[model samples]
Target: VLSEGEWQLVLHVWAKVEADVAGHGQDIHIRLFKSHPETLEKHDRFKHLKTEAEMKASEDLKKHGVTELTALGAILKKKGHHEAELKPLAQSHATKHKIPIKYLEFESEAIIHVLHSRHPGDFGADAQGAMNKALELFRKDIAAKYKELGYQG
Candidate 1:
């Protein structure tokens, strides 16, 4: 669980995220792919794109990244209280979309990376730790839903 102070810190960072959800989301995706090549292999649409420049220039990739951020944006606005909002994602990604559940952590890490990169001064140790805690809980929420839906990483 997040402390009141932690929640406040997260929201403080989120204030900036609200304005450039797409930009940050795309950055997270780019970083995710750069750090983990296997993740890029999972995306049929994005797999064909080889270079960072190619990924950045792709409108489809941008739209996909924005969709992911849009979902996260909604959850963050609720201060991570509404993880059930991710159930649809858990179900779709696990079943229909067929994304590996283990990759979730990579995505979470990428999100933190983008947050810290975008606002290093604001995302100090305390805030970074708080966000990590929240993302852990978020991952657990998705894992639970994945298990409930009969999917395993």
Candidate 2:
């Protein structure tokens, strides 16, 4: 449910954090584990990071962090948008990984946290609200498949 202007707001703000998303955007990735420490156990790839600070230190987490951030960037840049992007992700989380859709709540917060942290000089309520809406629309697109697979919510 994002209007064009709101998407633009988020996109413009995204530029400021493009540098932080470097090396595969894993720093932001670590921030999520730090933000939602409980979910650290929810990931197989995350085991390398014993503690939140270690996660920030590891180059491997950085790879995944960058991977995830780039993928998110692609979704934001798509003309009509991308389906192949999140379809399998939803499937893996639901069917293979057994991760529930509710867990995505941390992602929404992680994104906002990155923006605020990166643009401390410029970021404010307007940017936060825009990014929230952008992430909401994205989750709606993503969670649809998570629900369709009979994951029991």
Candidate 3:
């Protein structure tokens, strides 16, 4: 979904934040729960977190946050050849974990918010727009998996 130039921009911006990818994940989930608190319940480990501070200090939250960003990192690095990696992930979410599909959109929004907030100068409109398209593709990929698995929409 990204042009060569846009892909270059994505790599440039990704480099800036990759070192603190876990922190970005943490911040992303925090922002997500802040806006969609009910989604927190979806995470068994994090369901007990009743406040922002609690979520921040959560080891479970941090680990899952890392998992979230790590998947994104793998997806980005793989470019268009990520089916081997993403297929199982999509299957798990669709069949095993049963994550509500809307959380995909919320997570994307949270990712964009955190990236822009952290790198105001680097994550400009062009970078943000590229990331948005990438994330849109990710969401759709997962949604398609859910459909194929016969998960009720």
Candidate 4:
């Protein structure tokens, strides 16, 4: 669960992160693939993006990054009322992406990488911790995606 401060931290930074990504995606995607290679297997559209240079040239990967960032934008726009709004994401992942809930945390860190980069100055520990807490909470919502869906895996 996020403390109120952590909740506020996400809301404050998400818009900037979303805006920042408009000018950047390849860097974020490279960081994500390097950090969590297994996570890439699930993104069918982004499957060909196996290298930093490959990620740089792929519009599909860019759109995929933007979609996640857009979802994050919507969740933050809700401020602290996240759980309710986030439930559908889990469902969407299961139905739309055909991915199990197990991978959402890895999915989330990609956006986190972008957020940290977009932050104005030093993206310090206290701030990173707060956003991470909220990201955990958000992934929890994503984790519940398969519960009622008769998820096979």
Candidate 5:
């Protein structure tokens, strides 16, 4: 579970996105599975969640687009919502090495799961692109807000 402060920050960011992308049916959802083994045992659909690391990786990928190996490794090392902070470092590493973080098949359900798990009440019925764009804007605004609130990377 997220700390109260972290929850507040996430909510603020989400609110900004909602306001900016008003009328868009796209919405975010968040979900917290009990773990790979438990999820698989409980739900046949989650049979893919075989390992703890895999389950966490899937959550990280859904939450922060950590489809790349580097991002996945980074999350494995640091167990927190540090993915957003690592974005610039990841980008620089990609640029310096002439590598790219290729986009994989990220389903809208995954994104919605993350958002709904966090904020169940607030969501719109929009398309994937609209939701993605709004979330991107939300992240940008949240980073700025963090800086303003004395959060240093």
Candidate 6:
């Protein structure tokens, strides 16, 4: 069981990601107040905004390919690119939310460790193959980060 503080931290991380993913437009700022109800309300607001944004984007895509292209361009600009001179805004956001990332990393590692410990020799070859694919994905992400930093190997 997580402590109250830990639970609040989890909620705050969820709320921030939810707000961003849902297109809340209120800025992805997280408040650390000790009010569970308020936090939940904010999460709900994020969900509503996200649903609306998805519908709007879908309609826009159906109306014109240019809309989709422009949106993709804008997102690329926001995320920056190779030799773009401007630092990627996503990196800044990640730095700002390092705590949440660390928490998630810890959670993921714990789950993987528990699964390995508890299910040793219990899975089919296909399950093991899937785990290999997941590990490959993890490695690819790490390599991509290095590539982003101008590292070749």
Best by lDDT: 1
Error of 2 at 153 (Å): 4.1
lDDT of 5 by residue, 1-153 (tens): 334444444444355344433111212211223312232333344447555466454543343322332343343233245556556644443344322121111223445455554445554333233445433443444344445444331
Task: Quote model 1's TM-score.
Answer: 0.92
Query: Candidate 2 lDDT, tens digit per residue, 1-153?
Result: 667877778788777657667632664567767677666777777776777678767776777677778778877765226677777777777787776556676877877776776676656898788778777777776677666766553
TM-score (all chains, Cα) for each model:
0.92, 0.83, 0.93, 0.78, 0.27, 0.25
Per-prediction CA RMSD (Å)? 1.4, 2.3, 1.3, 2.7, 14.1, 15.8
> Candidate 6 lDDT (Cα, whole model)?
0.33
Error of 5 at 64 (Å): 10
Q: Using alpha carbons, what is the TM-score of model 6?
A: 0.25
Ranking by TM-score: 3, 1, 2, 4, 5, 6
* Pairs with backbone N, CA or C atoms under 3 Å apart (clashes), candidate 3: none
lDDT accuracy of residue 6 in candidate 3: 76
Writing each residue's lDDT as its tens digit, candidate 6 over 1-153 gives 223443343333333333333222211111111212233233332333233245345433223323322332343232222223223422432343222233323323432343344445533344434433343343344345545755232
TM-score of 3: 0.93
Let me know the TM-score candidate 4 reaches against the reference structure.
Answer: 0.78
Clashes of each: 0, 5, 0, 0, 14, 1
Query: Which scores greater on lDDT, model 2 or model 3?
Result: 3
Q: Considering TM-score, which of the candidate structures 2 and 6 is the better prediction for this target?
A: 2
Among all windows of 10 consecutive residues in model 2, the one with the lowest summed lDDT is: 19-28
lDDT by residue for model 4 (37-133), tens: 7667767677776777787777778777676677777776665577676777766777777775556666567666766766746356776787777
Tell me the lDDT of model 2 at 29: 64
**Model 6, runs deviating above 4 Å:** 1-114, 120-122
